[PDB]
């Protein structure tokens with residue numbers, strides 16, 4: 121259900137939800153077929169170790185079972201610095217803010233990518249936190265503290281967006 125969303129916002133959300141589902145699907149597949157260190161993995165999740173790979177694999181397995189198109193969306197927030205937000209314990213509802221409408225459907229810091237970021241926050245999906253924001257900080261987190269990287273929402277978003285594309 122939509123709450124406080126204009127017609128244009130509903131249309132953008134519909135496209136973003138479908139793209140986010142695709143992002144999660146492709147990301148899950150990647151994690152299932154790559155069971156050793158690769159550029160795309162280490163860049164966002166740090167040094168490859170089975171434990172952490174299992175952690176992210178679980179997150180995407182859970183998110184893949186989510187139906188993004190059936191999520192409830194709320195467009196009342198007007199915070200320009202925030203893309204969106206959710207309550208980890210209240211699954212299925214995403215609250216969109218100002219920056220969301222200025223973001224492209226797909227790509228880096230995209231609407232679709234933001235939904236992946238927010239979905240990862242739900243406890244049912246792994247309950248990621250926000251230890252770092254942005255590609256620069258996310259990459260730094262992956263190198264310096266991989267344990268937090270696999271529990272950081274933006275690292276999941278960037279791994280999924282994969283832009284620039286990495287093998």
Ligand SMILES: *[C@H]1O[C@H](CO)[C@@H](O)[C@H](O)[C@@H]1O
Nearest residue numbers: 157158159161162163167
């Ligand atoms: C992440 O780090 C690994 C190093 O183990 C590379 O394989 C990859 O290119 C990326 O920089």
Ligand SMILES: [Zn+2]
Nearest residue numbers: 237249250273
């Ligand atoms: Zn977040």
